[PDB]
Amino acid sequence: IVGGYTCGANTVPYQVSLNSGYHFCGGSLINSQWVVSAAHCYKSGIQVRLGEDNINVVEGNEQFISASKSIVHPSYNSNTLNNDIMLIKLKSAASLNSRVASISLPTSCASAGTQCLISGWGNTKSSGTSYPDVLKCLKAPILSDSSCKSAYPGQITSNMFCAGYLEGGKDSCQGDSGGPVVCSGKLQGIVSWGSGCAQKNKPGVYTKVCNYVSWIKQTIASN
Ligand SMILES: [Ca+2]
Ligand SMILES: [Cl-]
Ligand SMILES: [Zn+2]
Ligand SMILES: [Zn+2]
């Protein structure tokens, strides 16, 4: 995340780190047994780490559980990143406490202008590589579709929305993929792609979760 701040140890209690020997993506806990992340984060051999603050230091409040299965959205297109969402089931249930909590799924989509909180352990430099070890946060509004589509012509579908600042300066960045975008207490987005990080007129693009609630609910209930 670039132009963001240190959230604080466990202040985004629904934030997860996907690890396959190292941290490679973020995710959101939706209930004791399931995590939602980006389909482009699909890997075989995932370990989910909950209650994480510093990914390189075991400070006692962590839970490391292996994934029992992964379900990529049936219509995921790796070329356009359209329908970039995946569900991960935990082999054992997470013990929910003050530091490990689930986030709610939306009942309706959020309007442009709404302020959201984007978090993760990604790169913090636009022009440079600096990978932080503690969680970073960024408060950013949802942009109108018009400004999102002018920045990426022919690339935005109805399953994506942009958030950030057009001036640039603030944005999600690689590493952060699969992480949450929460607005008014609901998980409204998943970090999906962007043009580099924090550039001017290049906001981040997020998977629009409100369009997949029935698929999420139906799939978790059947698996
Ligand atoms: Ca840790
Ligand atoms: Cl992340
Ligand atoms: Zn990351
Ligand atoms: Zn990515």
Question: In this structure, are 37 and 114 located in the same domain?
Answer: no
Q: Tokens representing 187?
A: 């998980």
For 112, counting Cβ atoms within 10 Å of its Cβ (0-12 exposed, 13-18 middle, 19+ buried), the class is middle
The domain in which residue 72 lies consists of: 13-102+211-223
155 in a labelled binding site: no
Query: What radius of gyration do the chain's Cα atoms show?
Result: 16
DSSP character at residue 81: T
Q: Which residues, by Cβ under 5 Å, contact ligand 3, an ion?
A: 26, 120-122, 175-176
Q: Tokens representing 217?
A: 């609910």
Q: Resolution of this PDB entry, in A?
A: 1.5
Q: What's the 33 CA to ligand 2 centre distance in angstroms?
A: 20
| Alpha carbon distance 98, 178 (integer Å) | 22
- Count Cβ atoms below 10 Å from residue 56 Cβ, excluding itself: 11
177 in a labelled binding site: yes
Q: Tokens representing 210?
A: 């409100």
145 in a labelled binding site: no
Q: What's the residue count for the chain?
A: 223
170: Cα separation from own chain's centroid: 16
Question: In this structure, are 17 and 81 located in the same domain?
Answer: yes
| Alpha carbon distance 38, 73 (integer Å) | 9
Question: In this structure, are 76 and 178 located in the same domain?
Answer: no
Residues 6+ apart with CB under 8 A from 3: 138, 165, 169, 170, 171, 198
Q: How many domains does the chain have?
A: 2
What is the H or E stretch that residue 88 is in? strand 86-90
133 a catalytic residue: no
Tell me the CB-side half-sphere exposure of residue 21, using CA atoms within 13 A.
3
23, 37, 40, 176: which is the annotated catalytic residue?
40
Question: In this structure, are 204 and 119 located in the same domain?
Answer: yes
| Alpha carbon distance 198, 200 (integer Å) | 7
Q: Are 13 and 100 in contact (CB under 8 A)?
A: yes
